[PDB]
Structure 1
Amino acid sequence: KEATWVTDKPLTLKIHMHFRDKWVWDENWPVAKESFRLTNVKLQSVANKAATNSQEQFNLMMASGDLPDVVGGDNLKDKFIQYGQEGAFVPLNKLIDQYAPHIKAFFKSHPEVERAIKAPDGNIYFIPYVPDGVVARGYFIREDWLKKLNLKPPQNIDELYTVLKAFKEKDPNAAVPFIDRHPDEVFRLVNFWGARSSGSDNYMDFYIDNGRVKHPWAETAFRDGMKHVAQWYKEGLIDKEIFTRKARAREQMFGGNLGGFTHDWFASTMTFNEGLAKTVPGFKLIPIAPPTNSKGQRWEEDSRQKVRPDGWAITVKNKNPVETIKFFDFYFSRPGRDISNFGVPGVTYDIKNGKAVFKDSVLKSPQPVNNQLYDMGAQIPIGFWQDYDYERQWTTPEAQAGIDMYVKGKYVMPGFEGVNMTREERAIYDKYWADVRTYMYEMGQAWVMGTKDVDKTWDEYQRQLKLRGLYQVLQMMQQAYDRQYK
């Protein structure tokens, strides 16, 4: 027995966890065996290993009505709230009060996070992934390519065009100026012509503009930005396979000495300098401040969230609600944050000076440390309290200089934190928003690739947003916002 045991009798719980369109809970994960060893709760993965769409899997699972004991994963918040209210998950408030001292104490100290995750009925239907940190993504450019071509790091959008055009036309390596492992980043490019693409680290999020709730993709600023993005795409400044390359884009495009420029996270993006040192002679990425946009400002639209829309819930089928909440509580305690952030003691880390310290092999490894942790069951989107010291330990000094530059320059835009809708308001949001958003993404794709001309289609686009309920959503969001702020 361990001090962390939540039951004396071993308990197997069925988990449906399908995430990032690729992965399921793997009971072979060292971290999962370590979770079992420390908690005496074993998880049994029932999600389809072959499926390549996480959100449809959750939906089909719900549809089938063959529910497991626990459901977890990414971008589940809205569904945890909707299906919890409908009786598929149980509320957690009273379970937490009585049996989850760590989650309890976390919510009491973070009342804005509690508030962000509650359903209109005041119920907590899930335990969230809680990030730790300040900045998220930044702009990175090939300084070795800047040198080769004798070009200054670009200071504004006119200069960025000129630099990227030069990566294209002058063969600094087949050269592909902009690449990204997140296709949504292509739309974030509208930032350079003074348009938002999001109000938060969640892509295609709402924002507030002088106390008006707006969607960035509805705005004519977005229209004009997108006409430039399509042009850049037409010119091959953007990876032709931007929408399909995905997760391994950096391994492929930087490793193969093809990619010049990206917008990604500081810790992992900057490890490629050490990692690709043997295979690509003199590969050097530098963090750059966001080149000034057409409106005369330097925008970093992205920031680390106080709570992400990911985590896990307890289904109606769970015959062991009490053991389960105690199992969730583990990941909000020191030893649970240890394994879920650091991996396995004696394998990927050891306790030194009262804290988890990654081993030398983990730190010197060419793979980003978070990628190493994914492969073993850690830094995955269950309900857990992230510890930024895990990240600090593999943040290079060069990555840290870049962050400090972002912090000093005040480039990071304030994030949208959500609104607190009533039952009726949130019902409209739930009825429409998913659909609206998928249409927006499909339209944006069409504009970027040149399938549709932004100007000839902007009006039918507005028409569509209207009959797809977007403006009805915004009005309900505006009502909730005004109740709270104005």
Structure 2
Amino acid sequence: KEATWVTDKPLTLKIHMHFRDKWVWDENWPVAKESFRLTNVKLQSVANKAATNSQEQFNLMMASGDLPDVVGGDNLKDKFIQYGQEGAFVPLNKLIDQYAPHIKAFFKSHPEVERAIKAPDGNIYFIPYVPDGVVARGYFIREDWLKKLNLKPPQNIDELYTVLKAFKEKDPNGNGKADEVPFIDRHPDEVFRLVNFWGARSSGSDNYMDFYIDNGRVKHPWAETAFRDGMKHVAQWYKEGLIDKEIFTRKARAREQMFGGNLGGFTHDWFASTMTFNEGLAKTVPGFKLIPIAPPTNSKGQRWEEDSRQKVRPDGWAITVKNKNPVETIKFFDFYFSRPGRDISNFGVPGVTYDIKNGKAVFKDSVLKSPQPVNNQLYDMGAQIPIGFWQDYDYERQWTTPEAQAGIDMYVKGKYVMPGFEGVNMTREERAIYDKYWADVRTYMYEMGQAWVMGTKDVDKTWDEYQRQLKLRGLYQVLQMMQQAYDRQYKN
């Protein structure tokens, strides 16, 4: 028996969790075993680990007719609302009230967090993931490649263009080839974010391809006529080889390849995990130094950082109607908002990854001295996964390098950070339009975007046809509906 037990009798449940097209839930996970010993609830994962796309597996599991006990994952928020309304997911509201003190207290202390996850009816069908922090992404560049190539770090777009040109043409790594790739990243969508250098928005929030509020009017960054101006130039950057050719396909292994093979000169990504590499591969790559840099002056004469860390996110887990045990499950979810739950969901397993020091969890030397980023280890261990847990920023502060913190403070002090997009509250009638159309819309946008970047089609020639296709796809219906939801809230 334990004090953290949500049930006296051992509870084994079937959970289908497929997220980020990489990991599936594992009951043999150290974090999961810890969670089982603490909560007296065992989560058995029914999923295909050999599967690739997560959203596809979600749709398949849903349309299979046979529902598991708990459904977790990422970007399932809208789907959580759809099937929550359709009756596939049980409303947790009163369960949260009576049986989940920590969750209720959190939503009480965070009304703006609770508001976003609410259905048109107001019910909460899922316990979400709430990342803690301020900054999200910032630009990074090689220190040594600026020196031996004899040039000062770029203050603007032109200087950056000349720097990347000097990376591709002149040989910065001294191997004697042109093989080095100026721009890389482990997020393909970042290839669009480059349009910020020309003053174009790639999104409205942390989530890629998201609407934003411009002077009280809801608008999509991609549908705007200032988007293809930047898309042209980044397509030129690909054409010049300034951008990674595999940048769409390479994905997660990017930073561990280009930087490890010393082929990369520039990236975006995030502060901590990127700055971890400096210490990590320092023994392999002799002269490697990666430094944080300001968001260089755009064509608009401004300093733009489009990505900030959003409160909560479209992530989490929900309870199906076939669960038969709503109480133990909602209490199990309540456990992850508790201090020990946060401890095991962030810092991993005590006695292995971290120890308890004066009330605060501190990672072991084994974890901190590892070349591989801590979060990448916790992923494999079952921690920092997009479950209903509350993130603890201290865990990130521990392995954050002083230069990374300096870059963070630089971005905060510089106020390059843009305000995030909170979203709107839609009624049940106007929600269906978004739910049905927006998926196909953003799929189309991403496919055409990838077609533009790689230079398969032409930006200018296919621009009008693209606009008309967006018109017939029903995008502007969702847009005007979003304006219908927005204008009722913010007036003055």
Fold-level similarity (TM above 0.5)? yes
Counterpart-to-counterpart distance in 2, 1:262 and 1:348? 29
Deviations 1:101-121 (A, max 9, x none): 000100000000000000001
Equivalent residue runs for 1:231-242 within 5 Å: 231-242=236-247
Give the C-alpha shift of residue 151 in structure 1.
1.2
Counterpart-to-counterpart distance in 2, 1:268 and 1:29? 23
The one of 335, 338, 358 equivalent to 1:353 is 358
Give the C-alpha shift of residue 20 in structure 1.
1.0
Percent of aligned positions with the same letter in both sequences? 100
Counterpart-to-counterpart distance in 2, 1:164 and 1:448? 17
Counterpart-to-counterpart distance in 2, 1:128 and 1:47? 21
Counterpart-to-counterpart distance in 1, 2:251 and 2:171? 24
Deviations 1:57-114 (A, max 9, x none): 0000001011100000111111001111001110110100010000010000000000
Question: What secondary structure does 2:226 align onto?
Answer: helix
Residue in structure 2 matched with residue 393 of structure 1 by the alignment: 398
Counterpart-to-counterpart distance in 2, 1:270 and 1:262? 12
User: Structure 1 regions of 5+ residues with no counterpart?
Assistant: none
The one of 187, 195, 199 equivalent to 1:190 is 195
Give the C-alpha shift of residue 425 in structure 1.
1.6
Counterpart-to-counterpart distance in 2, 1:184 and 1:441? 9
Give the C-alpha shift of residue 148 in structure 1.
1.4
Counterpart-to-counterpart distance in 2, 1:209 and 1:241? 34
Counterpart-to-counterpart distance in 2, 1:388 and 1:471? 38
Residue in structure 2 matched with residue 141 of structure 1 by the alignment: 141
Counterpart-to-counterpart distance in 1, 2:103 and 2:52? 32
Pair 1:317-2:322 in alignment: yes
Counterpart-to-counterpart distance in 1, 2:171 and 2:29? 43
Question: What secondary structure does 2:6 align onto?
Answer: coil
Structure 1 residue ranges, 4+ long, deviating more than 3 angstroms after superposition: none
Counterpart-to-counterpart distance in 1, 2:82 and 2:419? 28
Question: What secondary structure does 2:8 align onto?
Answer: coil
Give the C-alpha shift of residue 338 in structure 1.
0.1
Counterpart-to-counterpart distance in 1, 2:156 and 2:167? 16
Give the C-alpha shift of residue 431 in structure 1.
1.6
The one of 378, 393, 408 equivalent to 2:383 is 378
- TM-score of the superposition, structure 1-length normalised? 0.99
Give the C-alpha shift of residue 241 in structure 1.
0.4
Pair 1:214-2:207 in alignment: no
Deviations 1:399-447 (A, max 9, x none): 0000000000000010111111111121111121000000000111111
Question: What secondary structure does 1:16 align onto?
Answer: strand
Give the C-alpha shift of residue 375 in structure 1.
1.0
Counterpart-to-counterpart distance in 2, 1:130 and 1:141? 30
Give the C-alpha shift of residue 22 in structure 1.
1.8
Question: What secondary structure does 1:188 align onto?
Answer: helix
Question: What secondary structure does 2:273 align onto?
Answer: helix
Question: What secondary structure does 2:399 align onto?
Answer: coil
Question: What secondary structure does 1:124 align onto?
Answer: coil
Give the C-alpha shift of residue 476 in structure 1.
0.5
Counterpart-to-counterpart distance in 2, 1:2 and 1:136? 37
Counterpart-to-counterpart distance in 2, 1:4 and 1:308? 27
Counterpart-to-counterpart distance in 2, 1:26 and 1:249? 26
Give the C-alpha shift of residue 219 in structure 1.
0.5
Deviations 1:160-187 (A, max 9, x none): 1100111100111x11000010000000
Deviations 1:320-345 (A, max 9, x none): 01000000000000000000000001
Counterpart-to-counterpart distance in 2, 1:279 and 1:164? 24
Counterpart-to-counterpart distance in 2, 1:415 and 1:151? 35
Give the C-alpha shift of residue 372 in structure 1.
1.0
Counterpart-to-counterpart distance in 1, 2:290 and 2:65? 49
Give the C-alpha shift of residue 248 in structure 1.
1.2
Deviations 1:297-331 (A, max 9, x none): 11110010101100000011101010000000000
Give the C-alpha shift of residue 353 in structure 1.
1.0
Residue in structure 1 matched with residue 169 of structure 2 by the alignment: 169
Give the C-alpha shift of residue 282 in structure 1.
1.6
Counterpart-to-counterpart distance in 2, 1:322 and 1:33? 21
User: Structure 2 regions of 5+ residues with no counterpart?
Assistant: 173-178
Counterpart-to-counterpart distance in 2, 1:94 and 1:469? 37
The one of 232, 255, 260 equivalent to 1:250 is 255
Counterpart-to-counterpart distance in 1, 2:166 and 2:212? 35
Give the C-alpha shift of residue 191 in structure 1.
0.5
Question: What secondary structure does 1:137 align onto?
Answer: coil
Pair 1:114-2:114 in alignment: yes
Question: What secondary structure does 1:367 align onto?
Answer: coil
- TM-score of the superposition, structure 2-length normalised? 0.98
The one of 478, 481, 484 equivalent to 2:483 is 478
Counterpart-to-counterpart distance in 2, 1:399 and 1:349? 22
Equivalent residue runs for 1:305-454 within 5 Å: 305-454=310-459
Counterpart-to-counterpart distance in 1, 2:42 and 2:326? 15
Counterpart-to-counterpart distance in 1, 2:73 and 2:152? 43
Deviations 1:130-157 (A, max 9, x none): 0100000110001111111011111000
Deviations 1:432-477 (A, max 9, x none): 1000000000111111011110000000100011111100001000
Counterpart-to-counterpart distance in 1, 2:163 and 2:108? 50
Give the C-alpha shift of residue 354 in structure 1.
0.7
Give the C-alpha shift of residue 357 in structure 1.
0.6
Counterpart-to-counterpart distance in 1, 2:87 and 2:377? 37
Counterpart-to-counterpart distance in 2, 1:347 and 1:431? 45
Counterpart-to-counterpart distance in 2, 1:195 and 1:413? 13
Counterpart-to-counterpart distance in 1, 2:123 and 2:253? 38
Give the C-alpha shift of residue 23 in structure 1.
1.3
Counterpart-to-counterpart distance in 2, 1:273 and 1:22? 25
Give the C-alpha shift of residue 364 in structure 1.
1.0
Question: What secondary structure does 1:43 align onto?
Answer: strand
Counterpart-to-counterpart distance in 2, 1:259 and 1:203? 23
Counterpart-to-counterpart distance in 1, 2:147 and 2:378? 35
Counterpart-to-counterpart distance in 2, 1:217 and 1:89? 33
Question: What secondary structure does 1:220 align onto?
Answer: coil
Counterpart-to-counterpart distance in 1, 2:3 and 2:159? 59
Deviations 1:373-414 (A, max 9, x none): 111000000011000000000101010000000000000010
Counterpart-to-counterpart distance in 2, 1:351 and 1:275? 26
**How many pairs align?**
485
Deviations 1:251-276 (A, max 9, x none): 00100100111111101010000001
Counterpart-to-counterpart distance in 1, 2:183 and 2:456? 20
